[PDB]
Structure formats: structure tokens, C-alpha cells
Amino acid sequence: FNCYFPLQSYGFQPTNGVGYQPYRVVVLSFELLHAPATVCGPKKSTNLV
Amino acid sequence: KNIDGYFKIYSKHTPINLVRDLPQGFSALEPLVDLPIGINITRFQTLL
Amino acid sequence: VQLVESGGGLMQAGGSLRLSCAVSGRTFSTAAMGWFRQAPGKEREFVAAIRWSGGSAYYADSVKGRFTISRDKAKNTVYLQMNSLKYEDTAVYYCARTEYVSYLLSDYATWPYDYWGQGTQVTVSS
Ligand SMILES: *[C@@H]1O[C@H](CO)[C@@H](O)[C@H](O)[C@H]1NC(C)=O
């Protein structure tokens, strides 16, 4: 009584509603410390003349 | 050396015939490695 | 995944028996284990449940103060210590397992379990 387990399972079934169906989520957070930026983008090149 | 977070490693290999001490002469060290560590360094040691 | 029961059998009233149920095969997770029993001609009935995490136990009224459920996580085994045996305890005892985590322990008394052992006879004599 008044002492419950803090966690609970998800009811993920193939027939479940879209709202109740599982969804995989990725959150991308960017950081700028007092350090070199080591994660850069492609910066695609062009042909040489 | 370690400057603004980058670890710079230069090196040079040469042949010698001189057990007693460092050879007198002149030779320059080309860079080999540039590490973006951003790590503090104030002490080091060698491993043999 | 298999539930393998052992122990039990014949014991005179007032005595004590221990049932074991070992879980074999690759499991992702275990939420809870339970013991049920079925006496001849009667419906299968909840006996006890234990949460795998923390080891909190929930008991049918009929076995309170007599039976103890316990778990050895490292051996993936649940136990039922059956003390002060009565004729009414004579039944086939079944191990059960679920991956369903309820915040509410009492739910394990009525939750339909996913996995079942083969059943082990306990017979209480005079
Ligand atoms: C790195 O060393 C400097 C020089 O003492 C100091 O001010 C700074 O607190 C150090 N930073 C870390 C990561 O401890």
C-alpha cells in the first residue's frame, strides 16, 4: 500500500493503434566545448579547371 | 606539444654509430600526427 | 525458453517441502515469477508471485504465513517453501513466468502468464 514499482511495461502489439504503436526516436544534440570541433560535414568538392 | 587542444607529434628517424652520446649535426623533424584531443597535459612518462 | 520444475512429491501433514523452478534458454528480461496449483476437478488457482527486481512477494490468502516464495537471480530459479502442509495443499503445482512489468505487485495474482512449467505433484498424507 502506497509502495509501488516505479517502472511499467509498454503494450506493443501489431494490432495496436498508431498512437499506442512503438516508435523509435533519436535526439541529436550538438556540443561546442573548449576543444577542437571534430564532427564536420561533407563540403562536397567541384571539378578542376 | 599540445596547443589549443591539438596534440602535435613530429618525428624523425636516422642511422647513427654513436653509443656514447647524442650526434652533433642538424636534422629537421617532419610532422606525423595531429590529434584533436582537447585534453589537458602537464605530466608524461615513457614505456619500454 | 523452458521452465523446469522439481521437488515436491509426498509429505505427511505438518511437514515442509520445497519446489524449484529453473528458467533455461535465452531470456531478454524477467518481470516476475509465480506459482499456481490445480487440485483434481478444481480450477487452477494463484499461490504466490515474486518480482524479479527487488524480490517483493504477493501471496494467496490460503497460503499466507505457511508458504514462502523466493528467487535466485544468478541461478534463474524461483522456489516455493511449503511449510505446515495441509490436505488442501494436495495439487499439481505450476511455475509461471512473465516479462510484463506492472507498477502494482497485486496484478501478478490475476495477470495471464506467458510461460508455464510442466507441473509437479504435491501429495499431503495423514
Ligand atoms: C587545465 O589546466 C589549466 C592550467 O592549470 C587549468 O586552469 C584548468 O583548470 C585545467 N582544466 C582541466 C580540464 O582540469
Nearest CA in chain A to C53: A5
Chain A residues lying within 8 Å of B5, measured CB to CB: 34-36
For CA atoms A14, C23, C108, C7, the dihedral sign is positive
Nearest CA in chain C to A12: C100
Question: Position of cell 624523425?
Answer: B12
Say how many C-beta atoms besides its own lie within 10 A of residue C89's C-beta: 22
Separation CA C74–CA C76 (nearest Å): 6
Task: Give yes or no for A33 touching B (CB within 8 A).
Answer: yes
Sequence spans of domains, chain C: 2-124
Q: Quick one: which of C49, C88, C87, C91 has its CA closest to C70? A: C49
Give the single-character DSSP code of B37. Answer: -
Separation CA C41–CA A4 (nearest Å): 36
Fold of C2-124: Immunoglobulin-like (2.60.40)
- How was it solved? cryo-EM
Burial pattern C42-75, b for ≥16 Cβ within 10 A else e, equals eeeebbbbbbbeeeebbbbeebeeebbbebeeee
Amino acid identity for residue C94 in this structure? Y
Task: Give yes or no for A1 touching C (CB within 8 A).
Answer: no
Using only C-alpha atoms, what is the Rg of chain B? 15
Chain A residues lying within 8 Å of C53, measured CB to CB: 5
Q: Quick one: which of C122, C126, C125 has its CA closest to C47? A: C122
Separation CA C93–CA C118 (nearest Å): 9
Amino acid identity for residue A45 in this structure? S
Q: Which residues pair with C80 in a beta bridge?
A: C19, C69
Q: What is the resolution of this structure in A?
A: 3.4
